[PDB]
Amino acid sequence: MPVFHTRTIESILEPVAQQISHLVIMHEEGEVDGKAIPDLTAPVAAVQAAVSNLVRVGKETVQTTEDQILKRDMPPAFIKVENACTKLVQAAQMLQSDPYSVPARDYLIDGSRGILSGTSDLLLTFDEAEVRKIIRVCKGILEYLTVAEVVETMEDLVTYTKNLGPGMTKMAKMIDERQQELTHQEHRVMLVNSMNTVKELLPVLISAMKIFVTTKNSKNQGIEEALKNRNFTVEKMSAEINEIIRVLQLTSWDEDAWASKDTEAMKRALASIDSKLNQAKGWLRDPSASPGDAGEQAIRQILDEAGKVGELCAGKERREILGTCKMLGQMTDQVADLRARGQGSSPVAMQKAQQVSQGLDVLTAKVENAARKLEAMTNSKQSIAKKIDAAQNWLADPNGGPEGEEQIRGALAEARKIAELCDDPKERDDILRSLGEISALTSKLADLRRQGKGDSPEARALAKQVATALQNLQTKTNRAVANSRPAKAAVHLEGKIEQAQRWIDNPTVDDRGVGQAAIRGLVAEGHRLANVMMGPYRQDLLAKCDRVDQLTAQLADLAARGEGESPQARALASQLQDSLKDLKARMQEAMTQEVSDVFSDTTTPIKLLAVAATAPPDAPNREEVFDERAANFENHSGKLGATAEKAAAVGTANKSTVEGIQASVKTARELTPQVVSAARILLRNPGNQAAYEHFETMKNQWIDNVEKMTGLVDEAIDTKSLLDASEEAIKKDLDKCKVAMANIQPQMLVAGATSIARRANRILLVAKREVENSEDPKFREAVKAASDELSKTISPMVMDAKAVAGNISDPGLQKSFLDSGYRILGAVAKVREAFQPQEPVNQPILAAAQSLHREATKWSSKGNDIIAAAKRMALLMAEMSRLVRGGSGTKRALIQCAKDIAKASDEVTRLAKEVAKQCTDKRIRTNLLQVCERIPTISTQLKILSTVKATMLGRTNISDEESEQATEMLVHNAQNLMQSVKETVREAEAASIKI
């Protein structure tokens, strides 16, 4: 298992990769030819010289690191490479004896993998104790997080500040070290963007400590919610401290991410459906007296929240919940058109309305029960990872009496069978070979009893046999996820467009719902878009939602019956994509109007919260006046918490923002009660200094959060979108301000006048973000300068707003006031002038290969700039995908092309950095570097794994599942390669057009 956990490992193995390729390629012609072998006497000690230094340090670490933890696995570890150290020099001198020795041919090549194992084995084994000190430091962080309740006095928090102070400084600097020591930039990003938060919420915690002891003096009603302020934020920081455990424990390329990242929607669902329940039913209990205010949108999101449950749960189950909601929605829409004729009152057609209310009850039952049958595999997957490496513990010591220990590895291996009893029901075929071999290791577990009558020298014998067996048990459960989680979606919509696109040819053979759930994903968001939009467009967009949604089963049948190549199945798939093209441009325009509305009052009710929280005299019902402002605050943010996800739905950008904006969402989600709890306790003792400034922490902690939201969500959308949306919003509100002056409305006028001002400052805010992101002042000077006109004309707004506030029939003021609006409209029109451009036993690597085989058809049909490297990668990626389980005699090109897979990868990285320095935008350059970092990270690994596979090839006494594990490394990481390439081939032009 040649790992790539640390920079120091690749700096040593890639030398050794050159070294063992210098000799295994010669071992070929010992086998395939038996010719006069060239005298490689000189590499023998020289490759030993690349090892003996590590051996002696490996002995020196035994000679120096005195804690027995590394002394239990590492001294057995270099025994193997010292067993390699025995044979390769004997392999030398026997080849000195005989150029043709069959007892040397086997003899040298057994060591060559024992090198590449054992070299790689030792370098991770160095990294073992390297990071376990950091775990205790992380535990020491968590120690203070256990002390984060211990503080009961103001003096204690100062000492606690004096506790965390050296702790946090000791913390982050070691984190910077492993940042340097790592090479997965996508996982490097995981580490730092955890670490900045736990530093950032740290004074917020300390401020919460400040406010707690003040409330410990008087407001011991608040120490309830201040603990709720505290312990949540304590649990918030400790969550990433829990998360950086597996970041530290991330030994190799991750598989467990999406199996754990997609657990979010279930906890999202269960706390959401209960709230959408009552507002749906009593809405639909009086149907024709319910026009669709929010229960229709509740009924909509009930379909939508259950719609992502079917994205999670799959198999035969995914046809069922998709069926019953499509059943329910047409049942409701039948009743919704019983409202248009209106003849159904509350008892008129209740026979239908109960079968709808029970029909939704089927929808809510199957989602909450498949939920526990979704998360149960993840309960076992974390469980099964514990005992597979616990194998090294008891196999190390030959114990005569580990009978209490015998029940531990005995019954937990039976709990692996319980996990196999959890693994069983999803499939049958691959199940029974695992459901048979689960008892096969119990026979080896039965072998623990006989030598458990005190026998050491055979406890080492089956140890090699259970060495293959233990990892084989995990590797089958490693396969248990490609048939228990369906083919997941891109968070990119255009990725899901591609995910939709690839499924159209061969539906059944792929991982499940690669387009089918992607079509289920793409259509379920337009439903989330259409409901908030207005009535006559609502069903109109639902018409555009459901005219393509009727193609769900219509494209789930032409491979389920017959083949799709019949033209009544081809054109029915071909007329699909025409209407499906009509989705995104509406769905973009759908989201476009939303964000310009919901982010209008971005800080505004918060200031209304603030002036509510500023001066209450504790009069009656004025706290209730705050309560609706408090109610406004969620109702503002809950729309904001809704929209930014829908902004993330149609973002059309980097992953990094759209993975980062969702992180910004849940900050704004979870700080939203943290605001109110801070806002309430300021209302409990108004006028207190420490209450005010801690509010001024937390409130301003929310602002720059929602500013970081604001400044990213408009970056999450395009500037063509928002300006037109701003322009149409401001002309409408000015007309709303105009018809407020048609009648006598002064106060609604000046509120709308200030509504311009809060939106005008937003416009100038966007004009800053272009300039700091544009590299050069090509015209971004005018982006300042037109916003400089805004900063001029913002002041005649409010001044005239007061000046027109005297009379609705103020003579000539409204002439100036519409002109004051007309000053804005030409200015925002100048912002449009800115952003214009015019101044063969494995074939899963086949799926990796046939990926970029189909991305050959993009960006043009005429020329090539970088593509030719990617396609000569792809055909060699196609060639190896044969050859990995291919013929048993051409393992030389396994490495000889992996040389190019090193080479042609990082050639593109050279091509990456040059257009990065050619481009005129730092964000596309920052997005280019985060994706092109992994290209050399991956590149040399495929050299390394090809060597291991050459030792797997022609071996004829390998436990072939380990070769299958070696195949799986060539499976996943070439898939991880091929996916990562087209990201750059996207940004080959997705960035380059910005010039």
121 phi, psi to nearest 5 deg = -65, -40
In this structure, whether the domain defined by 7-126 belongs to CATH 1.10.10.10 is answered with no
CATH number of 845-994: 1.20.120.230
Instruction: Please state, in angstroms and rounded to a whole number, the distance separating the CA atoms of residues 704 and 689.
Output: 22
Q: Please name the CATH architecture into which domain 148-256 falls.
A: Up-down Bundle (1.20)
Phi/psi region, residue 34 (left: phi>0; alpha: psi -120 to 50; beta: rest), is left
Task: Determine the Cα angle at 604 with ends 602 and 606, to 5°.
Answer: 100
Instruction: Please state, in angstroms and rounded to a whole number, the distance separating the CA atoms of residues 207 and 204.
Output: 5
For the chain, the C-alpha Rg in angstroms (whole number) is: 33
Token pair in block for residue 68: 């027995």
Residue 602 DSSP label: S
Instruction: Please state, in angstroms and rounded to a whole number, the distance separating the CA atoms of residues 597 and 640.
Output: 10
Residue type, 286: D
Q: Please name the CATH architecture into which domain 718-839 falls.
A: Up-down Bundle (1.20)
Instruction: Please state, in angstroms and rounded to a whole number, the distance separating the CA atoms of residues 926 and 916.
Output: 8
No. of helices (H) and no. of strands (E), the chain = 36, 0
Q: Could you tell me how many residues make up the chain? A: 995
Which residues are bridge partners to 774 per DSSP?
921
Cβ atoms of residues 265 and 307 within 8 Å: no
Token pair in block for residue 71: 């002394």
Token pair in block for residue 237: 């920081």
131 phi, psi to nearest 5 deg = -95, -15
Residue 615 DSSP label: -
Q: Which of 899, 980, 975 is nearest to 943 (CA)?
A: 899
Q: How was this structure determined?
A: cryo-EM
Count other C-beta atoms under 10 Å from residue 547's C-beta: 12
977: buried, middle or exposed (CB in 10 Å: 19+, 13-18, 0-12)? buried
Instruction: Please state, in angstroms and rounded to a whole number, the distance separating the CA atoms of residues 799 and 153.
Output: 51
Cβ atoms of residues 138 and 248 within 8 Å: yes
Distances (CA, A) of 710 to 223, 295, 478: 32, 29, 41
Q: How far apart are the first and last CA of the chain?
A: 45
Instruction: Please state, in angstroms and rounded to a whole number, the distance separating the CA atoms of residues 1 and 154.
Output: 53
Cβ atoms of residues 290 and 333 within 8 Å: no
774 phi, psi to nearest 5 deg = -60, 140
Instruction: Please state, in angstroms and rounded to a whole number, the distance separating the CA atoms of residues 615 and 612.
Output: 7
Cβ atoms of residues 415 and 383 within 8 Å: yes
Residue type, 117: S
Q: Which of 461, 733, 444, 413 is nearest to 601 (CA)?
A: 733
Instruction: Please state, in angstroms and rounded to a whole number, the distance separating the CA atoms of residues 432 and 435.
Output: 4
Torsional sign, CA 298, 301, 307, 308: negative
Residue type, 205: L
Cβ atoms of residues 90 and 107 within 8 Å: yes
Beta carbons within 8 Å of 596's beta carbon, 6+ residues apart = 722, 725, 726, 729
Q: Which residues of 832-841 are buried (b: 16+ CB within 10 A; e: fewer)?
A: eebeeeeeee
Count other C-beta atoms under 10 Å from residue 914's C-beta: 10
Q: Which residues of 367-377 are buried (b: 16+ CB within 10 A; e: fewer)?
A: beebbeebeeb
Torsional sign, CA 297, 298, 303, 308: positive
